Amino acid sequence: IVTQTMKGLDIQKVAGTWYSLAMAASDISLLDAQSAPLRVYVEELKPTPEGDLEILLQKWENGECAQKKIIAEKTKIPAVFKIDAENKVLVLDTDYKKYLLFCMENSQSLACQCLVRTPEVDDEALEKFDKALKALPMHIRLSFNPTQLEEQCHI
Amino acid sequence: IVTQTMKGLDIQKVAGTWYSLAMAASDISLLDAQSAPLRVYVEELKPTPEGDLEILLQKWENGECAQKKIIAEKTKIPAVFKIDAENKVLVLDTDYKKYLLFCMENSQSLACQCLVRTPEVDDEALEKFDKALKALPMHIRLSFNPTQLEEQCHI
Ligand SMILES: CCCCOc1ccc(OCCCN2CCOCC2)cc1
Ligand SMILES: CCCCOc1ccc(OCCCN2CCOCC2)cc1
């Protein structure tokens, strides 16, 4: 369903600190509550030397903001990785220095994010995210202010 | 804060059947859950002869989809009405035959909607709603498919 990907992705250069500035999803129920399944906040991305991608994130479950770690295994397409359960991650676009657009999907369920390096509202990167999105059937879209970004689980 | 209004509003011609196709709000907490305070679905608008506006809507409270009725009292500006508690309703735009854009606000808390006559996705009217919105600090946006539109409380 998502037919936008980044050409030439250097997976090593996305390592380190990120902020989930915005999130959208095909179904309201995937992002609606604090503990919605795809309301996940990205802390940091760790690409192994052999080209896999470890993701550190945060996730409200049972009243608490928990850390989580997950490995997204590489594929033959450099902009596409696999998490196990089945789930595909796709990198749509990034300039490495400021923003990164990604989506995750199954086999028409879908959630995408605007990751940014610093705790600021980047209008430019939200435009691009909004453009990449109009091509997709989203029904819920959220965004966070600089205060919430510095908080665990964006409270 | 919202500085868009409709010139020449004929309040009588908005009477009757409407569908809340989309909703946006300044704070996630105003629309996030089924029972969020501004997650209100519009059923029908009844403009009195003396220019006031009765609103029939639906609202999930305590496990059930309840009907509600409210009166929005007129003002000297024909595109602005008052509900009592304090709350201002503003009509931003409408073509009467298909769509109506409105916002409601207090004294920087804000929620807006794309109302449409029929249970269809009107891309045109969602554009306009999205344009009217970029001028505003929204942090949550939702939209409903034709099935959910025919259901009480859009389930
Ligand atoms: C290159 C882009 C990196 C972002 O990739 C993802 C980050 C988080 C994801 O969320 C997976 C959901 C994690 N679950 C939380 C609770 O259930 C178990 C794991 C998926 C991809
Ligand atoms: C001309 C546009 C008509 C839409 O106007 C409104 C429709 C619903 C509104 O919602 C008011 C919130 C209703 N509350 C629900 C639970 O608390 C008590 C009333 C406000 C304006």
Side-chain angles (χ1 to χ4, degrees):
Chain A
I1 171 152
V2 49
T3 51
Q4 190 201 331
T5 50
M6 209 216 162
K7 294 183 137 187
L9 180 55
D10 187 353
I11 193 49
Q12 291 293 337
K13 299 177 65 181
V14 299
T17 304
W18 293 105
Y19 287 77
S20 301
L21 178 57
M23 334 181 153
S26 46
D27 301 280
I28 287 156
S29 28
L30 300 175
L31 299 171
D32 53 7
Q34 286 164 288
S35 59
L38 267 29
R39 204 135 149 201
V40 294
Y41 310 97
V42 163
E43 301 322 314
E44 150 182 79
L45 301 167
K46 321 274 61 175
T48 65
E50 63 235 311
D52 284 358
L53 191 76
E54 315 166 282
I55 306 149
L56 314 196
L57 58 104
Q58 305 161 346
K59 211 263 179 297
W60 200 280
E61 299 165 326
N62 297 122
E64 211 150 67
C65 186
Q67 303 316 94
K68 307 226 87 196
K69 184 165 186 174
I70 50 185
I71 194 80
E73 299 182 327
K74 78 184 162 303
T75 76
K76 314 91 234 174
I77 311 107
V80 176
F81 307 78
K82 262 174 200 184
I83 310 143
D84 272 358
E86 167 48 44
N87 240 106
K88 251 180 63 201
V89 170
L90 302 82
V91 183
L92 307 214
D93 195 21
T94 179
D95 75 1
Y96 307 104
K97 60 185 74 80
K98 286 196 190 68
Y99 79 83
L100 189 148
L101 310 181
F102 85 90
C103 294
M104 41 177 116
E105 62 162 67
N106 259 11
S107 326
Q108 66 315 310
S109 220
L110 169 73
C112 307
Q113 311 208 350
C114 188
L115 304 188
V116 299
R117 293 290 197 185
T118 77
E120 292 169 296
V121 179
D122 196 337
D123 294 324
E124 197 204 0
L126 283 177
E127 290 174 5
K128 286 139 97 76
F129 177 59
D130 280 341
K131 301 314 125 68
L133 252 32
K134 64 165 293 315
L136 304 163
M138 306 311 213
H139 295 104
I140 178 159
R141 149 68 154 74
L142 313 174
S143 58
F144 302 95
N145 68 45
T147 306
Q148 296 169 329
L149 287 168
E150 284 292 279
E151 304 298 326
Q152 298 261 8
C153 280
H154 294 198
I155 55 187
Chain B
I1 171 152
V2 49
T3 51
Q4 190 201 331
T5 50
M6 209 216 162
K7 294 183 137 187
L9 180 55
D10 187 353
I11 193 49
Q12 291 293 337
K13 299 177 65 181
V14 299
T17 304
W18 293 105
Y19 287 77
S20 301
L21 178 57
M23 334 181 153
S26 46
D27 301 280
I28 287 156
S29 28
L30 300 175
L31 299 171
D32 53 7
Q34 286 164 288
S35 59
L38 267 29
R39 204 135 149 201
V40 294
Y41 310 97
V42 163
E43 301 323 314
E44 150 182 79
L45 301 167
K46 321 274 61 175
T48 65
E50 63 235 311
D52 284 358
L53 191 76
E54 315 166 282
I55 306 149
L56 314 196
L57 58 104
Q58 305 161 346
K59 211 263 179 297
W60 200 280
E61 299 165 326
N62 297 122
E64 211 150 67
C65 186
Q67 303 316 94
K68 307 226 87 196
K69 184 165 186 174
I70 50 185
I71 194 80
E73 299 182 327
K74 78 184 162 303
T75 76
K76 314 91 234 174
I77 311 107
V80 176
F81 307 78
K82 262 174 200 184
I83 310 143
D84 272 358
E86 167 47 44
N87 240 106
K88 251 180 63 201
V89 170
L90 302 82
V91 183
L92 307 214
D93 195 21
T94 179
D95 75 1
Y96 307 104
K97 60 185 74 80
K98 286 196 190 68
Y99 79 83
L100 189 148
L101 310 181
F102 85 90
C103 294
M104 41 177 116
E105 62 162 67
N106 259 11
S107 326
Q108 66 315 310
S109 220
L110 169 73
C112 307
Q113 311 208 350
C114 188
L115 304 188
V116 299
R117 293 290 197 185
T118 77
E120 292 169 296
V121 179
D122 196 337
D123 294 324
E124 197 204 0
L126 283 177
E127 290 174 5
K128 286 139 97 76
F129 177 59
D130 280 341
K131 301 314 125 68
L133 252 32
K134 64 165 293 315
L136 304 163
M138 306 311 213
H139 295 104
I140 178 159
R141 149 68 154 74
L142 313 174
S143 58
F144 302 95
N145 68 45
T147 306
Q148 296 169 329
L149 287 168
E150 284 292 279
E151 304 298 326
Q152 298 261 8
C153 280
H154 294 198
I155 55 187

